[PDB]
Amino acid sequence: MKKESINTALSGVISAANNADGRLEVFGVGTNNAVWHNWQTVPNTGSSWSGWHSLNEGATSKPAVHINSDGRLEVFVRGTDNALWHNWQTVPGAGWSGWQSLGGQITSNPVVYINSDGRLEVFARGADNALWHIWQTAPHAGPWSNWQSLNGVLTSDPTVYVNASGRPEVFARSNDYSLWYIKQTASHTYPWTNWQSLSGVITSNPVVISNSDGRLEVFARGSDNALWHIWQVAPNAGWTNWRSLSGIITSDPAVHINADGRLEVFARGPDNALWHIWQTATSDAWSEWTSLSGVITSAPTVAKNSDGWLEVFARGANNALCHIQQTTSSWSTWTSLGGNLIDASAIK
């Protein structure tokens, strides 16, 4: 992006969260363009699922869900008016409010962050291709703020994570195909930094996560269709250069931190199987690319159950939601959670 703007692959087809009681719940767009959801029924290891239930209305983005600091799930999606809409549990685990508009005009999928004080905050690309944000004005409560611009020129969904100083950093691809980012500070006069380049040539949505020690790390597909990554050399310090983890990935990458405190990345491979690769140590050590097989037609979505094990979801050949999970001793078989999912991604 130019100076004027610096002053402040297949996507996944679901968003997942844990309920206050640990139960996983997934949100996706069905063939009728409505948001549907499906949850674990019991706050218990080895739970069955509910089956798909409709939240009605009309979705034009991938949905995003985040738990409030009072335990209530809240889901966000772009509506047919290209405004941001939301719907929340009125008590932890049940009783959806129904959809209400937060307005704006957004041109990416919305991503959700929770501030250290418990205020939800949503980041999305605007009609002017700048990053915009909107927030709860009180912990787990409306009203929401007006939309505010953070400038920039975005060509991807933004990706956000809390840094070692408890504040958000937001990363996005720009119109030079490089990764740029902004970081929130304590400063009154400059609460957000100006957009800063981390270079690279990126051909997927990027995804940021924290290592167990607070070092932020970003994953993205490169121009060679390999998985690339870049990380902080110490908590809240400067970044490495871009380093290749090789492979050929045919979706956005997904990442989580496993029970060993190691980052583990999932992506679709060129055989349409699910592949994963993980840190084997702190310093400069990853596993080989490893196949979990299956046949998938979306990026994977990774979540973590209340026993601390990773669960992975992806669209199957029949548009059902495929499912595979880490157990105490191995990876499970592939099972289907059914449904009929579309890719309503706003950034495609």
Contact residues for Na ion, defined by CB under 5 A: 34-35, 57, 59
Longest CA–CA span in the chain (Å) reads 54
Q: Which is nearer to Na ion, 79 or 139 (CB)?
A: 79
The answer to whether residues 239 and 228 touch, using CB atoms and an 8 Å cutoff, is no
Question: Cβ 108 to Na ion, closest distance in Å?
Answer: 18
Q: Which is nearer to Na ion, 14 or 310 (CB)?
A: 14
Question: Cβ 124 to Na ion, closest distance in Å?
Answer: 17
CB hemisphere CA count around 340 (13 angstroms): 4
Residue 143, preceding peptide bond in cis (omega within 30° of 0): yes
Nearest alpha-carbon partner for 67 in 131, 137, 14, 15: 15
Question: Cβ 248 to Na ion, closest distance in Å?
Answer: 35
Strands 196-197 and 207-210: unpaired
Q: Which is nearer to Na ion, 57 or 307 (CB)?
A: 57
What is residue 3's DSSP assignment? G
The answer to whether residues 217 and 230 touch, using CB atoms and an 8 Å cutoff, is yes
Q: How far apart (Å, rounded) are the C-alpha atoms in residues 309 and 307?
A: 6
Question: Cβ 88 to Na ion, closest distance in Å?
Answer: 14
Residue 66 makes CB contacts below 8 A (sequence gap 6+) with 17, 73, 74, 76, 112, 113, 114, 120
Q: How far apart (Å, rounded) are the C-alpha atoms in residues 257 and 251?
A: 19
- Dihedrals phi, psi of 85, to nearest 5 degrees: -120, 155
Question: Cβ 100 to Na ion, closest distance in Å?
Answer: 12
The answer to whether residues 274 and 295 touch, using CB atoms and an 8 Å cutoff, is no
Question: Cβ 39 to Na ion, closest distance in Å?
Answer: 17
Q: Which is nearer to Na ion, 84 or 202 (CB)?
A: 84
**Amino acid (one-letter) located at 8:** T
Q: Which is nearer to Na ion, 20 or 342 (CB)?
A: 342
Q: Which is nearer to Na ion, 34 or 226 (CB)?
A: 34
Q: Which is nearer to Na ion, 35 or 216 (CB)?
A: 35
Question: Cβ 102 to Na ion, closest distance in Å?
Answer: 14
